[PDB]
Short mmCIF file of all heavy atoms in Angstrom, two decimals:
data_model
loop_
_atom_site.label_atom_id
_atom_site.label_comp_id
_atom_site.label_asym_id
_atom_site.label_seq_id
_atom_site.Cartn_x
_atom_site.Cartn_y
_atom_site.Cartn_z
N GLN U 115 -68.15 11.18 51.39
CA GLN U 115 -69.22 12.04 51.99
C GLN U 115 -69.61 13.22 51.07
O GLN U 115 -70.76 13.69 51.14
CB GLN U 115 -68.78 12.53 53.38
CG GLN U 115 -68.61 11.46 54.36
CD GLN U 115 -69.89 10.80 54.83
OE1 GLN U 115 -70.90 11.38 54.88
NE2 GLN U 115 -69.80 9.52 55.14
N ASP U 116 -68.66 13.70 50.26
CA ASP U 116 -68.99 14.79 49.32
C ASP U 116 -68.15 14.64 48.08
O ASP U 116 -67.41 13.69 47.97
CB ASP U 116 -68.68 16.14 50.05
CG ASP U 116 -69.57 17.26 49.58
OD1 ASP U 116 -70.04 17.23 48.46
OD2 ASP U 116 -69.74 18.21 50.32
N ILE U 117 -68.36 15.49 47.17
CA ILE U 117 -67.84 15.34 45.78
C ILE U 117 -66.36 15.31 45.72
O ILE U 117 -65.79 14.59 44.83
CB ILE U 117 -68.42 16.43 44.85
CG1 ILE U 117 -68.17 16.09 43.41
CG2 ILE U 117 -67.83 17.82 45.20
CD1 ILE U 117 -68.77 14.71 42.97
N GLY U 118 -65.69 16.00 46.58
CA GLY U 118 -64.18 15.90 46.75
C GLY U 118 -63.63 14.52 47.03
O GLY U 118 -62.42 14.26 46.74
N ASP U 119 -64.46 13.64 47.62
CA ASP U 119 -64.02 12.29 48.01
C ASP U 119 -64.08 11.30 46.90
O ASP U 119 -63.71 10.11 47.04
CB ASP U 119 -64.91 11.81 49.11
CG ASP U 119 -64.88 12.67 50.35
OD1 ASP U 119 -63.81 13.18 50.70
OD2 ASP U 119 -65.92 12.83 51.03
N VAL U 120 -64.53 11.73 45.69
CA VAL U 120 -64.62 10.79 44.52
C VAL U 120 -63.45 11.20 43.63
O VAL U 120 -63.30 12.36 43.24
CB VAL U 120 -65.90 10.98 43.74
CG1 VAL U 120 -66.01 10.05 42.55
CG2 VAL U 120 -67.12 10.79 44.59
N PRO U 121 -62.59 10.21 43.30
CA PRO U 121 -61.40 10.51 42.50
C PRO U 121 -61.75 11.28 41.20
O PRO U 121 -62.78 10.99 40.55
CB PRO U 121 -60.80 9.14 42.12
CG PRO U 121 -61.40 8.19 43.06
CD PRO U 121 -62.54 8.82 43.76
N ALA U 122 -60.89 12.21 40.80
CA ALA U 122 -61.07 13.03 39.63
C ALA U 122 -61.16 12.19 38.41
O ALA U 122 -61.94 12.51 37.54
CB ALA U 122 -59.93 14.02 39.52
N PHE U 123 -60.40 11.09 38.32
CA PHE U 123 -60.43 10.17 37.17
C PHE U 123 -61.85 9.61 36.95
O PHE U 123 -62.26 9.46 35.77
CB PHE U 123 -59.44 9.00 37.40
CG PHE U 123 -58.04 9.42 37.40
CD1 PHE U 123 -57.34 9.58 38.59
CD2 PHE U 123 -57.33 9.68 36.24
CE1 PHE U 123 -56.05 9.96 38.60
CE2 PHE U 123 -56.01 10.12 36.17
CZ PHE U 123 -55.37 10.25 37.40
N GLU U 124 -62.55 9.26 38.00
CA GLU U 124 -63.92 8.72 37.84
C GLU U 124 -64.94 9.79 37.45
O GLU U 124 -65.83 9.55 36.60
CB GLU U 124 -64.36 7.93 39.05
CG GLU U 124 -63.48 6.73 39.36
CD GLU U 124 -63.83 5.99 40.65
OE1 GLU U 124 -65.01 5.87 40.99
OE2 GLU U 124 -62.88 5.58 41.41
N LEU U 125 -64.84 10.97 38.06
CA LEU U 125 -65.66 12.09 37.73
C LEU U 125 -65.44 12.54 36.28
O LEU U 125 -66.47 12.79 35.59
CB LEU U 125 -65.49 13.27 38.68
CG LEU U 125 -65.90 13.03 40.16
CD1 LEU U 125 -65.53 14.25 40.96
CD2 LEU U 125 -67.36 12.64 40.32
N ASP U 126 -64.22 12.57 35.85
CA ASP U 126 -63.87 12.93 34.44
C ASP U 126 -64.53 11.93 33.41
O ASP U 126 -65.03 12.32 32.40
CB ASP U 126 -62.38 12.99 34.27
CG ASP U 126 -61.80 14.25 34.91
OD1 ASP U 126 -62.45 15.08 35.48
OD2 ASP U 126 -60.51 14.29 34.96
N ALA U 127 -64.42 10.65 33.74
CA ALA U 127 -64.98 9.63 32.88
C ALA U 127 -66.51 9.69 32.80
O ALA U 127 -67.07 9.51 31.73
CB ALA U 127 -64.51 8.20 33.28
N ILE U 128 -67.18 9.94 33.93
CA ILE U 128 -68.61 10.13 33.97
C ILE U 128 -69.02 11.40 33.11
O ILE U 128 -69.91 11.27 32.30
CB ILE U 128 -69.15 10.31 35.41
CG1 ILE U 128 -69.00 8.99 36.14
CG2 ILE U 128 -70.64 10.73 35.38
CD1 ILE U 128 -69.15 9.11 37.61
N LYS U 129 -68.28 12.47 33.30
CA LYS U 129 -68.51 13.64 32.46
C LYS U 129 -68.37 13.37 30.96
O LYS U 129 -69.17 13.79 30.16
CB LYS U 129 -67.60 14.83 32.90
CG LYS U 129 -67.70 16.02 32.01
CD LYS U 129 -67.06 17.28 32.67
CE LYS U 129 -66.82 18.38 31.64
NZ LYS U 129 -66.75 19.73 32.28
N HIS U 130 -67.28 12.62 30.67
CA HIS U 130 -66.97 12.28 29.30
C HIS U 130 -68.17 11.48 28.64
O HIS U 130 -68.49 11.71 27.51
CB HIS U 130 -65.73 11.49 29.19
CG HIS U 130 -65.19 11.28 27.78
ND1 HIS U 130 -65.54 10.23 27.05
CD2 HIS U 130 -64.41 12.03 27.01
CE1 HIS U 130 -65.00 10.27 25.85
NE2 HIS U 130 -64.29 11.42 25.79
N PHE U 131 -68.76 10.51 29.39
CA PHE U 131 -69.82 9.73 28.87
C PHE U 131 -70.98 10.65 28.48
O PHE U 131 -71.43 10.52 27.35
CB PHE U 131 -70.31 8.70 29.94
CG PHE U 131 -71.44 7.83 29.43
CD1 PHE U 131 -71.19 6.71 28.65
CD2 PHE U 131 -72.79 8.21 29.72
CE1 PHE U 131 -72.22 5.94 28.20
CE2 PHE U 131 -73.79 7.44 29.22
CZ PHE U 131 -73.52 6.31 28.45
N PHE U 132 -71.46 11.49 29.42
CA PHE U 132 -72.65 12.28 29.13
C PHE U 132 -72.44 13.40 28.02
O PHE U 132 -73.36 13.69 27.32
CB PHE U 132 -73.29 12.84 30.41
CG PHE U 132 -73.85 11.69 31.21
CD1 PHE U 132 -73.35 11.37 32.43
CD2 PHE U 132 -75.02 11.06 30.83
CE1 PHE U 132 -73.85 10.36 33.21
CE2 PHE U 132 -75.54 10.05 31.58
CZ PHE U 132 -74.95 9.67 32.80
N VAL U 133 -71.23 13.86 27.89
CA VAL U 133 -70.90 14.81 26.79
C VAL U 133 -70.96 14.09 25.41
O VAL U 133 -71.41 14.73 24.41
CB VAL U 133 -69.51 15.43 26.91
CG1 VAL U 133 -69.01 16.15 25.71
CG2 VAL U 133 -69.60 16.44 28.07
N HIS U 134 -70.52 12.86 25.31
CA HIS U 134 -70.31 12.18 24.05
C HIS U 134 -71.26 11.15 23.62
O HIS U 134 -71.25 10.74 22.45
CB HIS U 134 -68.87 11.69 23.97
CG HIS U 134 -67.84 12.77 23.98
ND1 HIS U 134 -67.69 13.62 22.90
CD2 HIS U 134 -66.92 13.12 24.88
CE1 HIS U 134 -66.70 14.49 23.21
NE2 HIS U 134 -66.22 14.17 24.37
N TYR U 135 -72.01 10.58 24.55
CA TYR U 135 -72.76 9.38 24.23
C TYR U 135 -73.81 9.50 23.13
O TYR U 135 -74.09 8.61 22.39
CB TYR U 135 -73.34 8.69 25.54
CG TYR U 135 -74.67 9.22 26.07
CD1 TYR U 135 -75.73 8.38 26.23
CD2 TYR U 135 -74.71 10.49 26.55
CE1 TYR U 135 -76.94 8.80 26.82
CE2 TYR U 135 -75.94 10.95 27.07
CZ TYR U 135 -77.00 10.17 27.19
OH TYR U 135 -78.24 10.58 27.74
N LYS U 136 -74.28 10.81 22.94
CA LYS U 136 -75.23 11.02 21.86
C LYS U 136 -74.56 11.85 20.72
O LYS U 136 -75.29 12.48 19.91
CB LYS U 136 -76.45 11.73 22.46
CG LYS U 136 -76.99 10.96 23.60
CD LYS U 136 -78.40 11.32 23.95
CE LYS U 136 -78.55 12.65 24.63
NZ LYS U 136 -79.92 12.85 25.18
N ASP U 137 -73.28 11.79 20.56
CA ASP U 137 -72.56 12.37 19.43
C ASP U 137 -73.08 12.01 18.09
O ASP U 137 -73.08 12.79 17.14
CB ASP U 137 -71.08 12.06 19.48
CG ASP U 137 -70.28 12.97 20.43
OD1 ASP U 137 -70.91 13.85 21.06
OD2 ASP U 137 -69.05 12.78 20.57
N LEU U 138 -73.53 10.69 17.94
CA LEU U 138 -74.00 10.21 16.67
C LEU U 138 -75.51 10.19 16.50
O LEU U 138 -76.08 9.51 15.62
CB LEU U 138 -73.41 8.83 16.45
CG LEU U 138 -71.91 8.85 16.00
CD1 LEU U 138 -71.30 7.48 16.09
CD2 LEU U 138 -71.77 9.50 14.63
N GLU U 139 -76.17 10.92 17.42
CA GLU U 139 -77.61 11.27 17.26
C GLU U 139 -77.72 12.78 17.05
O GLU U 139 -77.43 13.58 17.90
CB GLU U 139 -78.39 10.89 18.62
CG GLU U 139 -78.44 9.45 18.98
CD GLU U 139 -79.08 9.23 20.31
OE1 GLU U 139 -79.97 9.98 20.68
OE2 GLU U 139 -78.65 8.30 21.01
N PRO U 140 -78.20 13.21 15.86
CA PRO U 140 -78.30 14.64 15.51
C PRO U 140 -79.07 15.53 16.51
O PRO U 140 -80.04 15.08 17.12
CB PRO U 140 -79.09 14.54 14.14
CG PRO U 140 -78.76 13.26 13.61
CD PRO U 140 -78.41 12.29 14.69
N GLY U 141 -78.58 16.77 16.60
CA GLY U 141 -79.22 17.77 17.44
C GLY U 141 -78.87 17.78 18.94
O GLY U 141 -79.23 18.71 19.65
N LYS U 142 -78.15 16.73 19.35
CA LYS U 142 -77.92 16.69 20.79
C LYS U 142 -76.56 17.26 21.04
O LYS U 142 -75.58 17.08 20.28
CB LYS U 142 -77.91 15.20 21.22
CG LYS U 142 -79.30 14.73 21.54
CD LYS U 142 -80.10 14.53 20.29
CE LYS U 142 -80.37 13.06 20.03
NZ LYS U 142 -81.68 12.66 20.59
N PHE U 143 -76.43 18.06 22.12
CA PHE U 143 -75.22 18.55 22.58
C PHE U 143 -75.33 19.07 24.01
O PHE U 143 -76.41 19.30 24.49
CB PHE U 143 -74.63 19.68 21.69
CG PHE U 143 -75.60 20.83 21.47
CD1 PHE U 143 -75.36 21.97 22.11
CD2 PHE U 143 -76.60 20.77 20.58
CE1 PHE U 143 -76.19 23.12 21.91
CE2 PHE U 143 -77.48 21.81 20.40
CZ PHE U 143 -77.24 23.01 21.07
N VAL U 144 -74.20 19.20 24.68
CA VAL U 144 -74.15 19.73 26.03
C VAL U 144 -73.64 21.17 26.03
O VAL U 144 -72.52 21.47 25.63
CB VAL U 144 -73.32 18.85 26.95
CG1 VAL U 144 -73.03 19.53 28.30
CG2 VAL U 144 -73.95 17.54 27.14
N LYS U 145 -74.51 22.06 26.55
CA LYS U 145 -74.06 23.50 26.72
C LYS U 145 -73.27 23.78 27.96
O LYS U 145 -72.44 24.68 28.00
CB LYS U 145 -75.33 24.37 26.76
CG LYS U 145 -76.31 24.17 25.67
CD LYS U 145 -77.40 25.21 25.57
CE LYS U 145 -78.40 24.94 24.43
NZ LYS U 145 -78.79 26.18 23.75
N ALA U 146 -73.51 22.94 29.04
CA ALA U 146 -72.72 23.08 30.24
C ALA U 146 -72.67 21.78 31.00
O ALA U 146 -73.58 20.95 30.93
CB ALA U 146 -73.27 24.18 31.14
N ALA U 147 -71.67 21.60 31.81
CA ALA U 147 -71.41 20.35 32.52
C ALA U 147 -70.43 20.53 33.61
O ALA U 147 -69.20 20.74 33.27
CB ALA U 147 -71.02 19.22 31.53
N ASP U 148 -70.87 20.52 34.87
CA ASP U 148 -70.03 20.76 35.97
C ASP U 148 -70.43 19.92 37.10
O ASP U 148 -71.63 19.57 37.20
CB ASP U 148 -70.17 22.25 36.47
CG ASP U 148 -70.20 23.26 35.35
OD1 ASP U 148 -71.25 23.39 34.69
OD2 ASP U 148 -69.16 23.89 35.14
N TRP U 149 -69.48 19.51 37.96
CA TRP U 149 -69.81 18.80 39.18
C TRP U 149 -69.99 19.79 40.26
O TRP U 149 -69.31 20.78 40.44
CB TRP U 149 -68.59 17.92 39.57
CG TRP U 149 -68.49 16.73 38.68
CD1 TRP U 149 -67.65 16.65 37.55
CD2 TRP U 149 -69.24 15.52 38.73
NE1 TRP U 149 -67.88 15.41 36.96
CE2 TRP U 149 -68.85 14.75 37.60
CE3 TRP U 149 -70.29 15.10 39.50
CZ2 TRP U 149 -69.38 13.46 37.37
CZ3 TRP U 149 -70.84 13.83 39.29
CH2 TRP U 149 -70.39 13.09 38.22
N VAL U 150 -71.06 19.47 41.12
CA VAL U 150 -71.33 20.36 42.26
C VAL U 150 -71.40 19.44 43.44
O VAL U 150 -71.49 18.19 43.33
CB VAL U 150 -72.62 21.18 42.05
CG1 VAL U 150 -72.39 22.13 40.82
CG2 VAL U 150 -73.81 20.32 41.72
N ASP U 151 -71.49 20.03 44.64
CA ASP U 151 -71.35 19.29 45.89
C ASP U 151 -72.64 18.69 46.43
O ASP U 151 -73.76 18.82 45.80
CB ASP U 151 -70.69 20.15 46.94
CG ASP U 151 -71.58 21.33 47.36
OD1 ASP U 151 -72.70 21.49 46.93
OD2 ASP U 151 -71.06 22.15 48.20
N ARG U 152 -72.56 17.97 47.52
CA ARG U 152 -73.69 17.30 48.24
C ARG U 152 -74.79 18.26 48.56
O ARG U 152 -75.99 17.91 48.38
CB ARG U 152 -73.23 16.52 49.46
CG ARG U 152 -74.36 15.68 50.00
CD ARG U 152 -74.03 15.07 51.38
NE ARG U 152 -73.89 16.09 52.39
CZ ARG U 152 -72.78 16.40 53.07
NH1 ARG U 152 -71.69 15.66 52.88
NH2 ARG U 152 -72.83 17.33 53.96
#
């Protein structure tokens, strides 16, 4: 029902994807990345 109900392991892996998926494309980076609620 809300963000606390999703295991931390899955939220961490999703965060990891969006931080790194454009590592090998110049100029891209993430300044901030946080999970927030429903």
Side-chain angles (χ1 to χ4, degrees):
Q115 297 291 325
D116 209 334
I117 194 58
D119 302 322
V120 180
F123 295 100
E124 301 175 36
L125 298 175
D126 290 351
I128 292 164
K129 174 166 165 154
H130 190 270
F131 181 82
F132 292 110
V133 168
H134 295 291
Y135 80 123
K136 308 200 289 192
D137 279 358
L138 286 168
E139 295 174 36
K142 278 73 110 95
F143 56 102
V144 169
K145 309 193 179 216
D148 315 78
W149 289 98
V150 298
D151 68 4
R152 186 187 68 244

